[PDB]
Structures are given as structure tokens and as C-alpha cells.
């Protein structure tokens, strides 16, 4: 059967909802942004934005408004979801604890009813005494909003105007008054009703009916000192109150339809408009007073601000700062001048936020990191069309790289405080040391007085009370400054060697032989205190004093060889406190104890690179929450230092790591470097907050990237990318792309903006070909705005556009493959297309054209016309398999470099998605569901093995293995089909059975196999099998992986308990949220494990885990594990987190 695992990798970046107000307090201004299932909250600051809480939901946010009931201390948030769960939320902070509290919830609806096309709309009214909802045509849902009902009972009432465009509640009215625009055969009109909850029905509104426009799409309720509503359609924006009416038709509008508004000044003096082309509009209403004072209106003004990202949401803040929420591109903080710049434009961009969606295509490619690479590339679409490169971990670059063999350790320092930083670097070879002064990028050696050459030290660097310390292997040394001499120098009785060390700013230990000897620092001398014996040879040491500097430590960290144990010690009394023996014969290396955000931590990191970690309390010095994790094999060293507003802890290995903390749990982010050994924190004034690497072969030095879990590089195209693939042998990408064009009236089209393609270094242009359009083509120029499709060749390193190929006039590029075929060693770029004409709704002609790339010229080879649109194509056993309209044709590539059609499959309505494994073929149809073909090595034809009988409108398709098939559907659902393993009859073995169902809440555009995670290196076998990634329309990236029957049943009951304590937000049941739900049916999930729910176990409190585990004996099997599972399941959930 099928047991699957779904987990969110990269959260949706696309901004759905946006709303502003005072949700967290009154003194603060809040920004609330909705990203599909994510609610993110911010506080606006002085030239900045401060994030405070990030809560997810079991739903797609459809309505999101801030409103404050009379008398209510604050500000409540009404949220309505796509499945019609309604909730009123309130913000509460109790010291450290921040949770979102729901005042009232309920899934209002109609049990039956068709959801209107334009979507649902919710309005809460100025006085906050009801919530109006337009869920279905012909009815108007109104929710009486008093805290009671906490269950949100609502009643529907008859709406006889069956077709509403937009509706608003009115300001400054004696009674609750609705203002909507509906459409009937006489055109569309504005109309008002009084919504009386007495009688639970409408009453005659203050207005008679009007005949607005012919395309009015948005209504805005204008507040006082006025009332009534301004109606913005296209071509013309008009105002409407009882007696008065106002109307302007600025010609700067008809170019693009304006799609969003937002009130700037609370009085309703002026409003911000935004269109589909990212143009920003001011809208001013100038008021009037007769006599001493009255109130009236005198036309409008629009002044045209400038250009931003494509606004799906607009909201003003204060001091000319507007936040723009974009689904099709990056969201922006933007600043509004009173003075245009060179281009005109009062608009200037403050900050930009990365937005991945809509991801129309993605591909996993293994660049750079040679062995595995990890990178995931994807697409942005439109004017904000781009490639996004996504990779796990953090990277750094080497500015200066002088070769250097065989080091051990290295240290910074600065003698002069007046500059205030650390210079004159030092590194030690085997047996000796070398000093290197800093100036610019040049290092070398030079000579410094008093620095000891004949001996190697384990300590260096500047130290307090203006001095340097350097402790060698034969003795212990102290350094003076102004004269630069060696005041004080200390040896051990028998002239023995220094073995195990430690050291710190205000105190040091040096061990020698065994014991610790324990040193202490006085001004410019020593004066040691007491001595030590302990147990035999000691494995390394750390004094680090936990706190600001400090720099005196009441604490001493050490190790052992025989017993193998990182001890902690009191000072100067030592005395063993916590035992903790560790299994294995390996020995502990590189200890430390860190401090970050009040937390109290330590680390110990043995021979395997395996490393242990504790949560602690400094008071008793007692360790707890025992757990270790393992990485690589090579030794780790442990420094620790700062950078901006975080902290860092990081281990050094073949896979150089770093450990922080994120929302009060830890994080392990690797680094991309090959090999690290010794490396040291160097913050120079010619190198602010930087770092130096020492390597076995060279040094390194660089600046370090932004602080995240996932790194994202962005190359904007300024036009829509559609398909992508990788050409390893050309070290570059092929990107199907397009730009919009518009008529020049003088033949041609003269374009719109400089973008991608038009900036290529070489380029080429398609050449007819027959059609046949000849003998008076006879179309028109009508249906303005034209799309020109392109193929782009893009360097994998510089990401500069190498080559641009333009396709035929009126051609659509649909599919693209990179592959080689037959006994032909050349790797090709094959693109399938479709001709798209005004006169025709269904394409009847397309092309399968083959390209080969050599020295920026991009020559063409095949060029083969077909009757139909080639939707999908994919490499198939040295052959090209393609989908042309309703036909599935398999082409063969022959030695005369021509395309030859081997066989056909004619039984489809329209085949859009092709996936292949071995000889098997998975066909996705927009109409008649999924189909599994195979192939016949010596028959050629196409048998039809099995088919799913259940109709599904699919968005993307994929093969998990030989017998399981994954599909994505138009209602944000996932399903899996299987070929019946049971031979038996023919009937059952011709029926794929839907064994998996799961509501994703997102629209999946593309599936691809691959991962961004290294191999192991323990403890292979791996816990899950396979890894399928997917890109969505809202910019989310997820993962699908196979599971064993133990786990699916394990995590399934595990889900159910977790579904008892969460706490929900909105009180939405996880089962309901995950239930398969389309317009026709609602069915539970099954076959699918929500990984997000499982990994969200690590964040509850310890008595909560204990609340599930202590009875998670209610089921857990026998063999060597019971409640010991309580730290298995954390080690199982740790085992999850790492598959992505």
C-alpha cells in the first residue's frame, strides 16, 4: 500500500492579505500580513519594521480585518478562512509568553450552496455591530457580532440582486446601511439597503437606484466629515452620496485597471490606488465649507505617484511609508517624496522582501558543491520574473587566499586601543610559531620584539589591563606594551611539556601532565592559588565565564581519556558534581559553554565529530535534557564570538557547522566550505565583523552572508519565465520566457521596457516555416498587447544572459527538455510549442524544435511541425516522449538528425503532464484523470496497463515508485494512485486505486525528485525512503517521502494526541483542515502524514511531551524500547527535520 510523509520546507513568501491598526497595544502601530496559511505580525519603528509573532493556521485566510468593539480595551482580528471557518482573535503577552487568543469561533456556511466566482467578501461595519458576508449568490450572510455568540451563529437573508461586484458598509449613517454594486441586463448599478437584525431582514435604503458606469469594480466607503461612498471603476472614478455625486475620467487610468485602495488619512481626505501594472496612484478629495463652516466636495485629484511592485495589497503607515503586498513579486517598503527624482516618481524603495511565487517551474541541480550541490532554482513570473537559487546552510567567500601548508591554531590581537579592534595575526606550524602583521590584504611575517619565536603557544590575543598573554608548550608567558617586554614568566618544576590548556581574560589554567595546576591572573604577574590532582590525563579544557565578558569564571570545563567524560568544575574548589558516563572508546575533544538570549548552554564534541548538548541552570550548575547528535567524522574545534544581533557556536569539520538558537530552541546550520581546521574571529576596522580561515593548504578571509536557514539568490528577468532545465555540458540554463509587446502603429511593436532577452550578448530570431498563414493572413491588430516568447541561455555562475532566441509571431512555448538522444553524443535543448491565434480557442499547430548550444550562437537543428499543441515532453531511454493535445506520441532520434514518430496513444481528451520511470509512463489529463502506459521494446506500440476511474482536474503529477503515483488537484488536494499488486483477474489490475488523500492548502505547479541534504555518515539505514519536492503558486516548497508501515501507524496515532493539545489557533481541528475537500465532496485524509504537525512537537513544554509519552505506552511495541521512546521520538523527530 501507500504510506507517505508531507512537510513544509520553505514557507509561502507570497502576501495574500494585508491590514493595519493597533492589534498589540494602543501606543504601537501594527502591520498584519497574511501569507496564505501564515499570519505574520509587525510593529512599525523609526525607519524600520520589528517582527514580534509568527503564527500559522489550519486554513487559507480569505478575510482579515482589524476592528475594535465599543468599550473593548483594544482591537480584535476577524479572520475568515476558505473552508469558512470564522474566528475572532485577540493578542495577549504575559512576560515571555505570547499566544493568540480566540474570543469566538465557528465554521459558518450554508450546508449547500455554490461559492461565487469573485470569491467571498467580508465586511465588519464601522460601529462594529455585525459582520456581513457574501459567500453565495442570492444570499447575504450576516453575523451578529456580540461576543455572544461565541459560536458565531449567523442567519442568511434573501439577496435578489443575484450578481454583486463589491459591497461596503457605510460610515456616519443613522442605521446599518449596506452599499453594493450589482449587475443586471440594463448594466450595473449602485444600490443601498438597511440591514436590520430586528426582523432579520433588509429595509429600504436611503438611496434610489442609479446607473453607474458599465465596468465599475470597486467600492470604497468614505468616512466623515462626509459619508456615502466613492466608486472606482476603470476609465472613470465617481463619487456617490445621497444628493451629491462627483465624476472624473482621467485618461491615465484606461491603460491599466486599478485593483486596490487604502486609506491614508483617517478622515478620508485621501486614498492610495494601485493597478495591475504596479503603478501607484494618489487620490485626493478636496473638501468645502460655506459660511463659517459646512461640508461638501469639489472634484478629485490623482497626481500619479510612481511605480512599485505589483500591488495585490496596499497599506500606508506613517511618514510617507507604504507597504506593498505582492503575489507576483517581492513585497516592498516604499518611501513617498514631495519631490520627483530624475525619472519623475515620488516613489523610492526602502526595503524589499523575497517572494518565491508563483513558482511556475523549478529544477534541482548540483552545481558548485561538486558532490551534491543542493541548489534548487525556480521562477518568479511577470515584471517580477526572476530565477531564485535556493540552497541549505550558509556560505562565505575568500577575498585573499595565500597558500599555506600544515598549521595548528591561529590568533588575533591589537596592541593599540586608540584604533579599537584586533590586528597582527599569528599562526603556528608544527613545533614553531609565526607572526603576521595586518595592513590591507597583505600579510607576510615581519618581526616583532618580545614575541617568542623559538616556541609555540596555545594562547595569544589582547588581554585586559592593557597587555598580551602568550602561553607556550614549555612555559607560561606574559607581555607588557609600552616597553614591550616580558614581565613575569612561569615554568613547572621538572621542565616538562605543557599538554592540556584552557585560558581566559581574567584567569587561566595550564594543567601539565595531569591535574590542572590551576593558575590565576594578577596585574602583570601570577600568584597561583592551590593545586590539583584529579584522575590521570585530562582531555582539553575551557574556562569561558558565561555572561557579558565576564571575564572571571566561577567555572571550569575539562575532559578525560579513560573514563571519557566532560566534567564541569567549581572554582577554585573543583569537586566532582555531575557524573555522566558516555559509551564508546572514543575520547572527548573541544569543549565549551555558551551564552545566548538568557539561555545557558554547553558543548562537548568527541572523535566522531559527534557532539552532545544540554539545557542548563547556572545556579546549581546541574546539567539536564541529555541529548547528542552526530556529524561527519573529522575533529571539531570550538571558538565562539559574535556578529550583528545574534551569537554563534559552530563546529569545524569536513562539513563545517554552526549552532545558534531560533525562537528559543537550537539550530544547526552547516557551512559550504570544503575543509576547515583552525579559523578565528577577526573584526577589523578594514573588515567590520569578519573572520579568518587558516586551512591545510591556504588561508581564507571574507564577509559572510545574511543570517537565515535557507539562502536565496535572485536574478530578476523583468519578464515572465515559464520553464527551466540544466545543461551540464554547457554549464548553463535554458529558460523559456516571454515579454508583453503592444502595437507601434508603424508596423512592428516597439516593446515596452528594457528587460531580459533584449539584453542578450548574441541572440537569434526564429525563421518561418509555413503555417499556412499565406494568401492574405487576414487577422488584425485588434486584441492589442502581444506576447513574444523566448528561450534564454543563462550562465550557471555569473547568471548573465548568454543567448536569447525569439520564437515565431503568435507562438507559445510550453515544454522544454535538456538531453541527448540515440547514438548521438550531442546534448540538446528541445522545446515544444503551440501556435496561439485570436480566431482559435484550441491550438491546432505547434512545433517540437531542437537546439544545440556552442559558443553563444545557439544553432538550430530539427525544427519539426505537428498538428496540435505540445504540452509536455520528457527524455525517455535515449528517446523523446511528447504530448501533443490529446495524443501521446513517442519520437525516436535518428542519425540524419531528424525527428521520427515511432508509436502513438490516441485515447486522451488533453494530455498536459508526462512523467516517466523505466519503461512505464504516467500521463496526467486535465479531464479524464491519470493514466499509466508502459513500453514494448519489440512491438513498439502502447498497451494501456491501468487507469484511475475517478475524475480529477490536475495541476501536476509525479511518480513515487513503480506502483505509486502522486497527483495534485485544483482544490489544493493531494492524492495517490496504485497499480493493484494482486494479479487475480484483469479487471482489478486495470484499476488504479486512490489510496492517499490529503488537503495541502496550496496549488502545486511542479514536482521534482531530489534533496538539499547530505548523505551519512550515520546511521544509514535512513528512516524514510525517497524525497519528492514541489513548488506552489504561493511560493511554498514542500517534500514528499515514503514511509514504512510502523511509522505511518506510529505517527498517525501520534498526530491524534497532538491533535488534543496544540493549541489550534481559531480552534480548527487538524483533521477537518486536512480533510479532502472539493466543491462536490468532503472526505477524511488517510495515506498521508502531516510532517508539520509532527515536527511541531519539539516546541511544546516538557510536561506536555510527558502528557503524551507517559501513555504513549498505550500502544508502543516491545523490543528494547517503551517510554525510552520519549527520547526516541525526539530522536525520531530530530530524524525527520533533517530529511529537508
Amino acid at each position: 500500500h501507500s504510506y507517505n510523509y508531507v512537510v513544509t520546507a520553505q514557507k509561502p513568501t507570497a502576501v495574500n492579505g494585508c491590514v493595519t491598526g493597533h492589534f498589540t497595544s494602543a501606543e504601537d502601530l501594527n502591520l498584519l500580513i497574511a501569507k496564505n496559511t501564515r499570519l505574520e505580525i509587525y510593529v512599525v519603528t523609526a525607519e524600520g519594521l520589528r517582527p514580534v509573532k509568527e503564527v500559522g493556521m489550519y486554513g487559507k485566510i480569505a478575510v482579515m480585518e482589524l476592528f475594535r468593539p465599543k468599550g473593548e480595551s483594544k482591537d480584535l482580528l476577524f479572520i475568515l478562512t476558505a473552508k469558512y471557518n470564522a474566528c475572532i482573535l485577540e493578542y495577549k503577552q504575559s512576560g515571555e509568553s505570547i499566544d493568540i487568543i480566540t474570543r469566538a469561533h465557528g465554521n459558518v456556511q450554508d450546508r449547500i450552496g455554490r461559492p461565487s466566482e469573485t470569491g467571498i467578501i467580508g465586511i465588519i461595519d464601522p460601529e462594529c455591530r455585525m459582520i456581513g458576508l457574501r459567500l453565495y449568490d442570492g444570499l447575504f450572510k450576516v453575523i451578529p457580532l456580540d461576543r455572544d455568540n461565541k459560536e458565531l451563529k449567523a442567519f442568511n437573508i434573501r439577496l435578489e440582486e443575484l450578481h454583486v461586484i463589491d459591497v461596503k458598509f457605510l460610515y456616519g449613517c443613522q442605521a446599518p446601511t449596506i452599499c453594493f454594486v450589482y449587475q443586471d441586463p440594463q448594466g450595473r448599478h449602485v444600490k443601498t439597503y438597511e440591514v436590520s437584525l430586528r426582523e432579520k431582514e433588509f429595509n429600504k435604503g436611503p438611496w434610489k437606484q442609479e446607473n453607474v458606469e458599465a465596468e465599475a469594480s470597486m467600492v470604497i466607503a468614505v468616512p466623515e466629515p462626509f459619508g456615502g461612498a466613492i466608486i472606482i471603476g476603470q476609465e472613470s472614478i465617481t463619487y456617490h452620496n445621497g444628493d451629491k455625486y462627483l465624476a472624473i475620467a482621467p485618461p491615465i487610468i484606461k491603460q491599466s485597471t486599478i485593483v486596490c485602495h487604502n486609506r491614508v488619512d483617517p478622515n478620508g481626505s485621501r486614498y492610495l490606488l494601485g493597478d495591475m501594472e504596479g503603478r501607484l496612484f494618489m487620490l485626493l478629495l478636496e473638501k468645502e465649507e460655506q459660511m463659517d463652516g459646512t461640508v461638501t466636495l469639489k472634484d478629485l485629484r490623482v497626481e500619479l505617484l510612481g511605480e512599485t511592485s505589483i500591488a495585490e495589497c496596499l497599506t500606508y503607515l506613517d511618514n510617507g511609508v507604504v507597504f506593498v503586498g505582492s503575489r507576483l513579486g517581492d513585497s516592498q517598503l516604499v518611501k513617498l517624496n514631495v519631490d520627483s527624482n530624475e525619472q519623475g516618481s515620488y516613489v523610492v524603495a526602502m526595503e524589499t522582501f523575497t517572494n518565491l511565487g508563483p513558482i511556475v517551474d523549478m529544477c534541482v541541480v548540483d552545481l558548485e558543491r561538486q558532490g551534491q550541490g543542493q541548489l534548487v532554482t525556480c521562477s518568479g513570473a511577470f515584471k517580477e520574473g526572476s530565477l531564485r537559487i535556493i540552497r541549505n546552510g550558509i556560505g562565505i567567500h575568500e577575498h585573499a587566499s595565500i597558500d599555506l601548508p600544515g598549521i595548528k591554531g591561529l590568533w588575533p590581537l591589537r596592541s593599540d586601543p586608540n584604533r579599537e579592534t584586533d590586528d597582527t595575526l599569528v599562526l603556528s606550524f608544527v613545533g614553531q610559531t609565526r607572526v603576521l602583521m595586518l595592513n590591507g590584504e597583505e600579510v607576510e611575517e615581519t618581526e616583532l620584539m618580545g614575541f617568542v619565536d623559538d616556541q609555540q603557544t596555545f594562547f595569544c590575543g589582547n588581554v585586559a589591563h592593557q597587555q598580551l598573554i602568550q602561553i607556550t608548550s614549555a612555559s607560561v608567558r606574559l607581555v607588557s606594551q609600552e616597553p614591550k617586554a616580558l614581565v613575569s614568566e612561569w615554568k613547572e618544576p621538572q621542565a616538562k611539556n605543557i599538554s592540556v590548556a584552557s585560558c581566559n581574560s581574567s584567569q587561566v589554567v595550564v594543567a601539565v601532565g595531569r591535574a590542572l595546576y590551576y593558575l590565576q591572573i594578577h596585574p602583570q604577574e601570577l600568584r597561583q592559588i592551590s593545586h590539583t590532582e584529579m584522575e590521570h590525563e585530562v582531555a582539553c579544557l575551557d574556562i569561558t565565564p558565561l555572561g557579558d565578558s565576564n571575564g572571571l569564571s566561577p567555572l571550569c570545563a575539562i575532559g578525560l581519556w579513560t573514563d571519557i567524560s566532560a566534567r564541569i568544575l567549581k572554582l577554585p574548589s573543583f569537586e566532582l558534581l555531575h557524573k555522566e558516563m558516555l559509551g564508546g572508546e572514543i575520547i572527548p575533544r573541544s569543549i565549551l559553554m555558551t551564552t545566548f538570549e538568557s539561555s545557558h548552554y554547553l558543548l562537548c564534541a568527541l572523535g566522531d565529530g559527534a557532539l552532545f548538548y544540554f539545557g542548563l541552570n547556572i545556579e546549581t550548575g546541574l546539567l539536564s535534557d541529555r541529548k547528542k547528535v552526530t556529524l561527519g567524522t573529522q575533529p571539531t574545534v570550538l571558538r565562539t564570538f559574535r556578529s550583528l544581533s545574534t551569537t554563534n557556536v559552530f563546529a569545524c569539520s569536513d562539513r563545517p557547522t554552526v549552532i545558534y538558537s531560533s525562537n528559543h530552541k537550537l539550530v544547526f546550520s552547516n557551512v559550504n566550505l570544503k575543509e576547515v581546521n583552525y579559523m578565528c574571529p577577526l573584526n577589523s576596522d578594514g573588515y567590520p565583523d569578519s573572520l579568518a580561515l587558516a586551512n591545510n593548504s591556504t588561508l581564507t578571509i571574507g564577509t559572510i552572508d545574511e543570517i537565515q536557514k535557507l539562502h536565496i539568490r535572485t536574478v530578476p528577468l523583468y519578464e515572465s519565465p515559464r520553464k527551466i532545465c540544466y545543461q551540464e555540458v554547457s554549464q548553463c540554463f535554458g529558460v523559456l520566457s516571454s515579454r508583453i509587446e503592444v502595437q507601434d502603429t508603424s508596423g512592428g511593436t516597439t516593446a515596452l521596457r528594457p528587460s531580459a532577452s533584449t539584453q542578450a550578448l548574441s541572440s537569434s530570431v526564429s525563421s518561418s516555416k509555413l503555417f499556412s498563414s499565406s494568401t492574405a493572413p487576414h487577422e488584425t491588430s485588434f486584441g492589442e498587447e502581444v506576447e513574444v516568447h523566448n528561450l534564454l541561455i543563462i550562465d550557471q555562475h555569473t547568471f548573465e544572459v548568454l543567448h536569447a532566441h525569439q520564437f515565431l509571431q503568435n507562438e507559445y512555448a510550453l515544454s522544454l527538455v535538456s538531453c541527448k538522444l540515440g547514438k548521438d553524443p550531442n546534448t540538446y535543448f528541445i522545446v515544444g510549442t503551440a501556435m496561439v491565434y485570436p480566431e482559435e480557442a484550441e491550438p491546432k499547430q505547434g512545433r517540437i524544435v531542437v537546439f544545440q548550444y556552442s559558443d553563444g550562437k545557439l544553432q538550430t537543428v530539427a525544427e519539426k511541425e505537428v498538428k496540435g499543441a505540445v504540452y509536455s515532453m520528457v527524455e525517455f531511454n535515449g528517446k523523446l516522449l511528447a504530448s501533443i493535445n490529446s495524443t501521446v506520441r513517442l519520437y525516436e532520434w535518428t542519425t540524419e538528425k531528424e525527428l521520427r514518430t515511432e508509436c502513438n496513444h490516441y485515447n486522451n481528451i488533453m494530455a498536459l503532464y508526462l512523467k516517466t520511470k523505466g519503461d512505464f509512463i504516467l500521463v496526467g489529463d486535465l479531464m479524464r484523470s491519470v493514466l499509466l502506459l508502459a513500453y514494448k521494446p519489440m512491438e513498439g506500440n502502447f498497451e494501456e496497463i491501468a487507469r484511475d476511474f475517478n475524475p480529477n482536474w490536475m495541476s501536476a503529477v509525479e511518480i513515487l515508485d513503480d506502483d505509486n503515483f502522486l497527483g495534485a488537484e485544483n482544490a489544493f488536494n493531494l492524492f495517490v494512485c496504485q497499480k493493484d499488486s494482486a494479479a487475480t483477474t484483469d479487471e482489478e489490475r486495470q484499476h488504479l486505486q486512490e489510496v492517499g488523500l490529503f488537503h495541502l492548502g496550496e496549488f502545486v505547479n511542479v514536482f521534482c525528485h531530489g534533496s538539499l541534504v547530505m548523505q551519512n555518515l550515520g546511521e544509514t539505514s535512513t528512516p524514510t525512503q525517497g524525497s519528492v519536492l514541489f513548488g506552489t503558486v504561493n511560493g511554498m516548497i514542500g517534500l514528499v517521502t515514503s514511509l514504512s508501515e510502523s511509522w505511518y501507524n506510529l505517527l498517525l496515532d501520534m498526530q491524534n494526541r497532538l491533535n488534543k493539545v496544540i493549541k489550534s489557533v481559531g480552534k480548527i481541528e487538524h483533521s477537518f483542515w486536512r480533510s479532502f475537500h472539493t466543491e462536490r465532496k468532503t472526505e477524511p485524509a488517510t495515506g498521508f502524514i502531516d510532517g508539520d504537525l509532527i515536527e511541531s512537537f519539539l516546541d511544546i513544554s516538557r510536561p506536555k511531551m510527558q502528557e503524551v509519552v507517559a501513555n504513549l505506552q498505550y500502544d508502543d511495541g516491545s523490543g528494547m524500547k517503551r517510554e525510552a521512546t520519549a527520547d526516541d521520538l525526539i530522536k525520531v523527530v530530530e530524524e525527520l527535520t533533517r530529511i529537508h
Partner: protein, 402 residues
């Protein structure tokens, strides 16, 4: 005016048209102006492509209902090449009931007026399974599958027995039992979700059962024959009986019973044949016995959205014509019984199969072929919606493309 300016858009992209017939065509205009003659090249270039609206959906810009409406014009187009008839299989004593196989796209079942059922599946060339009845009062009225295992089916016969019987012939108990003679039933429907059965008879009273026993129902649902009953797929909980009265009366079963008690009950002119709940469960397709086809909404069950006049009479020896929704789409399918008296666009008004849009009421397509002039009073699309099976007199017609 607006329906021709509300069609090829469909909607997104909002750009293009918008002129509202050129900001009003001076009222039509009077005399010559277009009209529907040149409502031709407009609709000929309607939506621009699909492959670019699909991409607009792939970007999430275009709403789903926009797409599905421009996807059903991708349908209709192929439906205009449905014009050929792959197969036809007959038997004596005339066809009365029709049901598709819920799971399988190639099997269908037909009933007789003589008591004889056929389980016909294709792509097999194996011969259909059969059951032989009484050939007199063995008329089958309302034949439906068994939602559990398909190898069983429910049925309602004129012989007086609403039964559950295998296609292998052997009766698997009985649900309803007359005990007289002069009475029999005309309707039947079941449900997988709410686990029920239902049956309406010719006297106006109806029964409802679980798939196990349970006779919680017999109360008179009106005066004279109950021609048809249908359960709501998305509501379950809801029910609707259409019948001779000139009224459909609905119900929700459950609450409300005590005679003359029923939420809604909407009257008509003339007797009626069909209720037919929608795939979404909200609209009802009532289909009258003279012309006129009606559609109500879930918003106001009392008021119909609009009437579609369409010639389908009643006749003693012509199987009652019931119209039916299409799965997957908002389409309406019905056979035609041409009639000497009405308002008709297209002489000479042959017999054919008609298809309208449920949101408009306009005719989008018609299905006809000579060598088969018979009146098809049953058609009812398969659950995939890729084929049509008409019952036509002694014959069974399979509409596909190929």
C-alpha cells in the same frame, strides 16, 4: 444584449470588450445592427486560447470558476465530434430505466418494461449479462446500482417489488412489499453517504429505508403518482420528489413530517418527470411535461432562476423524458420530442439531443444522427463525463468520440 456580452469572457482577462455593446447600441439598435448574425466571429474568436488561460491559472491570477467555464468550451467542441455512435445494443419489450456504473467508465445498466435487465460493459467484446422478467407488469421504474459492491443493484418494478438483486439473477432479499396488486412504483434512489433507499410509487406515498431494513416511512407525499425522487449528493440529509401534481415538494426528510409540512413545495403547470439534484447539490432540474424546463436555486427554492422552453411531451408508450445535469460541468442534457405547436427558431425542428448551459439557458450543442430517428428520452452522462448513454425505445445508444 447581455449574455452575448457575457460569454466569450468568461472574464479574466477583464481587458477587451468592456464597451458594453459600444456603451449601448442606441437600443439594439432599431432595424439593422449586428445582430446575432455577427454574434458569430466574436464567439468564433472567444477566449484566446486555453493554453494561455491555463497559464493564467498556473499563476493563480485567474479564478478557478473562470477556468472551468472556459474549460467546458473545450468540452462542447469535442461534444461536436461526439456525433458518431460507437455501439448500439437492443432487446425486446422497450427500455425504461437507466443507470451508470459509479466506478467503471465502460459499464452501464438498462431496464425494460417487461422485467428484463442488462448489464452492458464494453472494451470487452464479451457478451452482456441478463435477467429475464415477466413481460407484462414487469416494467422497471428507476434502476440504480448498489453503492457497496457494483455486482449488485437496486430496482423498482411494476411487479410490485423494490428489490436488491444480483446481476447473476438471484434475488438478495426485498425492501418493499405491496401485498395487493393494483399498485406499483415509479421512482427509486439511494445514497452511499447517508445510507438510505427511497421509492415513490403511483399513489403519492413513498417509503424510505436504510440499506438495512427500517420502514420509518410511508406517509402520503401527495395526491397521485410520484414520478421521481432524488437525494442530494452534497447535502445527503436533503431529499426532493418530483411528480404529477404540477408540484415538486422537496423535503429534508428528518424534522418536519406531520402531513402538509415540508419546507418548500414549488408548483408548476402540467405534470413533471424529474427532480435531478445537481452534483454540487443546490439547483434542481425539474423538466416539465409539455415544454418548459425550470431551474431553482439553493438561495430561494421557491423562485426559479429561469425557464427554458423545450419540446418534450408526455405519451403513454413513450418513456418519460427526464433532463439531467452533467457531472463535472454545468451542462444540461435532454432528448427532444418535436411538437407541432410552439415558438421555434429552427425549422423543421427534428428529433435530437439538446444541451444547454445551466447558468444561461442557451443551447450550446445538439446531437443527432440518421439511421436512428427514435425519441431518446434518457441520456444521462457517465460519472467521468466523457461519454453518453441514451436509452431510445428498443435501443441503447453509446455516445463517444473516437
Amino acid at each position: 444584449r447581455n449574455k452575448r456580452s457575457r460569454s466569450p469572457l468568461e472574464l479574466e482577462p477583464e481587458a477587451k470588450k468592456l464597451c458594453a455593446k459600444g456603451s449601448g447600441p442606441s437600443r439594439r439598435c432599431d432595424s439593422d445592427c449586428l445582430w446575432v448574425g455577427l454574434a458569430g466571429p466574436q464567439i468564433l474568436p472567444p477566449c484566446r486560447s486555453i493554453v494561455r488561460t491555463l497559464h493564467q491559472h498556473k499563476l493563480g491570477r485567474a479564478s478557478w470558476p473562470s477556468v472551468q467555464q472556459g474549460l467546458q468550451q473545450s468540452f462542447l467542441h469535442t461534444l461536436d465530434s461526439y456525433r458518431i455512435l460507437q455501439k448500439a445494443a437492443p432487446f425486446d419489450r422497450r427500455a425504461t430505466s437507466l443507470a451508470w456504473h459509479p466506478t467503471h467508465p465502460s459499464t452501464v445498466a438498462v431496464g425494460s418494461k417487461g422485467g428484463d435487465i442488462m448489464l452492458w460493459n464494453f472494451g470487452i467484446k464479451d457478451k452482456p449479462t441478463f435477467i429475464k422478467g415477466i413481460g407484462a407488469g414487469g416494467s422497471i421504474t428507476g434502476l440504480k446500482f448498489n453503492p457497496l459492491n457494483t455486482n449488485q443493484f437496486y430496482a423498482s418494478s411494476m411487479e410490485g417489488t423494490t428489490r436488491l438483486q444480483d446481476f447473476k439473477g438471484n434475488i438478495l432479499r426485498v425492501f418493499a412489499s405491496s401485498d395487493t396488486i393494483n399498485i406499483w412504483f415509479c421512482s427509486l434512489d439511494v445514497s452511499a453517504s447517508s445510507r438510505m433507499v427511497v421509492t415513490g410509487d403511483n399513489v403519492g406515498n413513498v417509503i424510505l429505508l436504510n440499506m438495512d431494513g427500517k420502514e420509518l416511512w410511508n406517509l402520503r407525499m401527495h395526491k397521485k403518482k410520484v414520478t421521481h425522487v432524488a437525494l442530494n449528493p452534497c447535502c445527503d440529509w436533503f431529499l426532493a420528489t418530483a411528480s404529477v401534481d404540477q408540484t415538486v415538494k422537496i423535503w429534508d426528510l428528518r424534522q418536519v413530517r406531520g402531513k402538509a409540512s415540508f419546507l418548500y413545495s414549488l408548483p408548476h403547470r402540467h405534470p413533471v418527470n424529474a427532480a435531478c439534484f445537481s452534483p454540487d447539490g443546490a439547483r434542481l432540474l425539474t423538466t416539465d411535461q409539455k415544454s418548459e424546463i425550470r431551474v431553482y436555486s439553493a438561495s430561494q427554492w421557491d423562485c426559479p432562476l429561469g425557464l427554458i422552453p423545450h419540446p418534450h411531451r408526455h405519451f403513454q408508450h413513450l418513456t418519460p423524458i427526464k433532463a439531467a445535469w452533467h457531472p463535472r460541468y454545468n451542462l444540461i442534457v435532454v432528448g427532444r420530442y418535436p411538437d407541432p405547436n410552439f415558438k421555434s427558431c429552427t425549422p423543421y425542428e427534428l428529433r435530437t439531443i439538446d444541451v444547454f448551459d445551466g447558468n444561461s439557458g442557451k443551447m450550446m450543442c445538439q446531437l443527432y444522427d440518421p439511421e436512428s430517428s427514435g425519441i431518446s428520452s434518457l441520456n444521462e452522462f457517465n460519472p467521468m463525463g466523457d461519454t453518453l448513454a441514451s436509452a431510445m425505445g428498443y435501443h441503447i445508444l453509446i455516445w463517444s468520440e473516437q
